[PDB]
Design a protein around this nucleic acid. Sequence first.
DNA 1: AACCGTGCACTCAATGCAA
DNA 2: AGATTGCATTGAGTGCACGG
DNA 3: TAACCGTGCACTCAATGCAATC
DNA 4: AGATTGCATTGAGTGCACGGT
DNA 5: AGATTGCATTGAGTGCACGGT
DNA 6: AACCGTGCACTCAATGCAA
DNA 7: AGATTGCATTGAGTGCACGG
DNA 8: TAACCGTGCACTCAATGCAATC
DNA 9: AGATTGCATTGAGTGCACGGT
DNA 10: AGATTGCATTGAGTGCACGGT
Lengths: 44, 43, 41, 42, 42, 41, 44, 43, 45, 42, 44, 44, 43, 44, 45, 42, 44, 44, 43, 44
Amino acid sequence: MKKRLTITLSESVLENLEKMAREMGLSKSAMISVALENYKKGQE
Amino acid sequence: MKKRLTITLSESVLENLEKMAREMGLSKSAMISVALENYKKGQ
Amino acid sequence: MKKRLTITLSESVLENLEKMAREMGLSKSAMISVALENYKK
Amino acid sequence: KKRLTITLSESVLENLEKMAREMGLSKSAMISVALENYKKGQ
Amino acid sequence: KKRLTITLSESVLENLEKMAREMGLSKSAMISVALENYKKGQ
Amino acid sequence: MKKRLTITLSESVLENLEKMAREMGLSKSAMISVALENYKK
Amino acid sequence: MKKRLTITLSESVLENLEKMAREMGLSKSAMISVALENYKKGQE
Amino acid sequence: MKKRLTITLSESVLENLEKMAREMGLSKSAMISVALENYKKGQ
Amino acid sequence: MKKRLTITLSESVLENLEKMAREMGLSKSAMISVALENYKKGQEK
Amino acid sequence: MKKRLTITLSESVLENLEKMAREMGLSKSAMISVALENYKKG
Amino acid sequence: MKKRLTITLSESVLENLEKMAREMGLSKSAMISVALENYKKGQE
Amino acid sequence: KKRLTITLSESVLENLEKMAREMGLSKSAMISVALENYKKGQEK
Amino acid sequence: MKKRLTITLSESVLENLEKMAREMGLSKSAMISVALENYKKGQ
Amino acid sequence: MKKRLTITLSESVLENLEKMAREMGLSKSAMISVALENYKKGQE
Amino acid sequence: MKKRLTITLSESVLENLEKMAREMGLSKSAMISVALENYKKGQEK
Amino acid sequence: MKKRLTITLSESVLENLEKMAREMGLSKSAMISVALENYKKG
Amino acid sequence: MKKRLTITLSESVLENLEKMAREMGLSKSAMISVALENYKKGQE
Amino acid sequence: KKRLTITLSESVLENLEKMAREMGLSKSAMISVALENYKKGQEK
Amino acid sequence: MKKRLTITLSESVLENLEKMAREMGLSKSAMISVALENYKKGQ
Amino acid sequence: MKKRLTITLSESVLENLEKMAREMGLSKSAMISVALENYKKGQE
DNA sequence: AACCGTGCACTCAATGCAA
DNA sequence: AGATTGCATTGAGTGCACGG
DNA sequence: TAACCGTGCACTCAATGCAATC
DNA sequence: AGATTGCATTGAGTGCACGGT
DNA sequence: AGATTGCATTGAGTGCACGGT
DNA sequence: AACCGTGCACTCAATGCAA
DNA sequence: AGATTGCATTGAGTGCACGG
DNA sequence: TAACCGTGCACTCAATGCAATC
DNA sequence: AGATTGCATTGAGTGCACGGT
DNA sequence: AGATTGCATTGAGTGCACGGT
C-alpha cells in the first residue's frame, strides 16, 4: 500500500514547500510525491 | 533552520525514492530537497 | 482567474469529503475539483 | 447542513455551472453528487 | 424552477427520503437525479 | 397509504420528465416512481 | 417499434378503464396493454 | 354509450392481440374489452 | 367473411345474455363467442 | 316465452360449434344456451 | 365408442319423443339417452 | 308401429342392455318405458 | 329363453291392461313384465 | 267370459313370478292381476 | 559505510559551494555529490 | 585564499570520482571544483 | 588511446612544473598537455 | 638534468610530435618550451 | 637528419644565448632552433 | 676572441636558415645572432 | 363430416287356438 | 276347469348400408 | 305435423385507418 | 410525443319473414 | 381520484387544500 | 586499478677540437 | 680568415617494464 | 622541498523509526 | 485517516592536526 | 495564500470580506 517516513528540511525549503503545497492545493506529502515523480520522470 | 516532519508515500514512490537516493549517493531527505528545488525550478 | 464560491453540504457528505481529501492528500477544493472533472463520466 | 467556501479554476467552475445547469441541480448539489459518485470509482 | 405536486406509495417515498438523506440531497434533487439518470438506462 | 408531496424541478428536467412519461404512457408520478426504483442502481 | 389503432368501447367500460388507468397512474393505452398482457398470461 | 378512442401499442402486444382476437373470434375492440373486464376481475 | 346464423333462446337465457353482454360491453354475438370458447376450452385438452 | 335472434360467428368458432353440437347431440341453439348458462356459472 | 341400433316405437311415443326433443333442443338419440340415464338414476 | 335408428354412447348402450335384460324387456320396450316415465315426471 | 304361458283375467283387468299397454306403447307381455318387475322391486 | 290370453316372459321374470305366486298362494294368473292392479293404482 | 575524505578549495569555490548548498538546503557533501552526479551524467553515455 | 574541508561520500560516488579524477588527470579536489563550477553553469 | 613516453627536463623547469601542477591540482602529465594544448592554440 | 615519464592522449602526443618536428626540437625540448611559455603567460 | 655546423658569435651574444638557453632549459642548439623558427614566423 | 661553437639543427631549420641568410646577405653566424638578439629583445 | 331416415332381410317375440 | 304346450301366423326388434 | 333452422333483403352502427392539432 | 377527434369506408350484428325438412 | 396552483413559511423546497379535468 | 618513479639499455644529438 | 667536416666524448631523449 | 592528501580523535546535529493525540 | 511531535539512536558531516609522499 | 465564518439576502445556497493558520 503506502508507508510513512520522517525527514528534515531547511526552514527555507520547508517554507517554500509549504508554499507550493498550499498553492497547488496539496498536502506536503502529496507535493513531495509530485515533485519526486516529476523529478525522476525528467531523469531517464 | 532545520525543521523535521513526517510524510506518507506510496510504496512505489518510496521505493523509487530509495532507489534515486541510493544512486545519487544522497539521503532520502536530500533527494527530496533536490527534487523539490528542482521541481520549483521549471514548476 | 481562480474564483471563490460558498456552498452547503450535508454533514454526512462534508465528512466524507473531509475524509477522502485527507486520504488522498488533497485540499477540500482540490478534492471537489477532482471529483468534478472525474465525474463528467 | 454545513457550509464552507472553496476555490476553483474558472475552467472547472464554468464546467460545474454547466453540469449543474444541465442536470437542474444547484452547484452544491452537483458537487455532493460528483463527490458521492467519485466515492465509487478510483 | 417549476413546481408540481406528486403522489407516491409510502414504500417508495420512504425509500426516497432514505436515498436523498444518504446522498445529502433534497427530495426534489434526488428525483431530478434519478430522472436524468434513468434517461440513460431503459 | 399513498402520500402526496410537492417538489421543484428545473424547467429543463420537468420537460424531460413530461416527455419521458408521455412516451412511456406514464403519469409524472409513476414516471418518477419508476426512475426512483430503477435508480437505486 | 409500436403502432397505433382506433377502437370503440361501451361508455361503462371506457369509464372504468379511465378509472383504472387514473388510479394505477397509467395512460389508457398502457392500462390496456397491461390488461392484455395480464389477460393472456392467464390463458396458456 | 359507444365511445371511440385511439391507442398506441408495442408491435409485439399488438400482434399478440391480433392473434388472441383471431383465435377467440373476437374483434380487437372486443378482445380488449374482455381483457379489461377480465383484468378488473382479479385486479 | 363473418358467418351468420339464427338461433332460438328461452327468454330466460336471452335476457341473461342481454345482461351479461351489456355488463362486459360486448355484443350478443361476442358474448356468445366468448361463452363458447370459454366452454370448449373448459372441456378442451 | 322463447325468442329468436340472428348472430354472426367466425368460421372457426362456428365450425367448432357445429362439432360440439353434433358430438353432444344438441342443436346449435341449445349448444349455445348451454355454453352461456355454463359461462354464467364460471 | 359410439354405436348404432334400430328400434320400434309406438306412434304416440314416437310423436311425444319428437316433441320433447324439439322443445329441449336435443336429438332423438340424445333425448333417449337423457331419458335412459335419468331413468337409471331413478333407483337408489 | 314406427321404426327409427339411433346412436348411443357405448356406456349408455351398455347400461341399456343391462336394464332391459334385467327387466325382461326388449331395448325398444325399455326405452319406451324410460321415455314415458321421463315424461310423466315433467308434469303437475 | 323367452318362455311362453297362458293366463286368465277379469275383463275389467284385461281391458285396463290393454289400456296401459297401449298408452305406454308396450306389448301386453311387456306391459306385464313391467308391472311384475315393478311390483317386485317394492317387495 | 273371463278372457284368456297367451304371453311370453324372460325366464328370469317368469321364474320370479312363480316364486312370488307360490309364496303368496296365488295362481300365476292371479299374481299378475294383482301386480297389474297394483301397478295401476300407483300410477294414478 | 559512508566514506570520508578531505579536500582543498579556492575560497572562491568554497564560498560558492557554501552558497549553492545553503540555497538548495543541502550539505556541502550533498551539494558535492549532486554536482558530481550531475557532472558525470552530463558526460555520461 | 584556499581553505580545506572534510566531507563524506557514498562508495559508489567516491569510486566514480576516483575514476573521473584519474581519467582527466586531476586531483579529487580539482575534480570536485570542476564539477562544482560546471554544475553552477548548468 | 593513451600512450606513454619518457622525457628530460631541466631541474628548474621540472621544479616549476611540479609547482604549477600542484597549484592547479593537475598531474604533471595533465599540466604538460594543458601547456601543450594552450601553446598550440597560440597561433592563429 | 632530471628525467621523468608521462602519459598523453594520442591526439596530444600526435600534435606534440608534429610541433616538435616542425620546430626542429626534441619532444622534451618542445615541452620545455611550451611549459616556459605557458608560465610566462601567468604573470603581470 | 640532424645536420651539424659551426658558428662564431659575439661574446656578448653567446653569453646571452647561454643565459636564455639555461633559463628555458634548452640546449644552445635547441635554443637557437627556437629563435630561428621564431624569427621566421614573423617573416 | 669572438667565440666559436658547434651545433646541430634539423635539416628543415638549417635549410630555412641558409635561405634567410642568403636573402638577407648575412652569414649563417650573423643570421643567428640577429634572430637571437631579436628573439631576446622581444621577450623582454 | 358426423348423424339420421329407411328399404332389404331375417328370426324370434307375442298371441289366438285347442287337445 | 283353469293351465301346459305344440302348431301356426305375422308384427316387433334390430343389422346393414346407400343417400341425404 | 309444427316448430326450428337457413338465408337473402335491408339498415345502423360498430370497428378502425388517417392525420391536422394539442 | 402520444392522445383527441372529425372524415370516411365497409363489414359486424341483428330484425324479418318465405321455404324447407 | 389525482393534478394544478396560489397562500404561506423557512431554511428553492414543501405543506395545504379549494378547483379542475 | 590506472598512473607515476626509476634503473637497465641504446643511439643519436650537442659540442670541443683542428686541418 | 671565418666556415666545412671527420674524429672523439658523453649527456640528452626515450623504450621498457617491475614496484609502488 | 612544500603543499596536498589520508585518517584517527572528537562532537553535533541531521536523518529517521516509533506511536499516543488531533 | 494522514499529520504533529517528543523520545530515542547512530550515522552523516566536518574541524583538526600528526605522518606521509 | 487559501480557509473559516458571521452578516446579509432571496429564492438552503451563495456573495462578501475581516481574521486565522
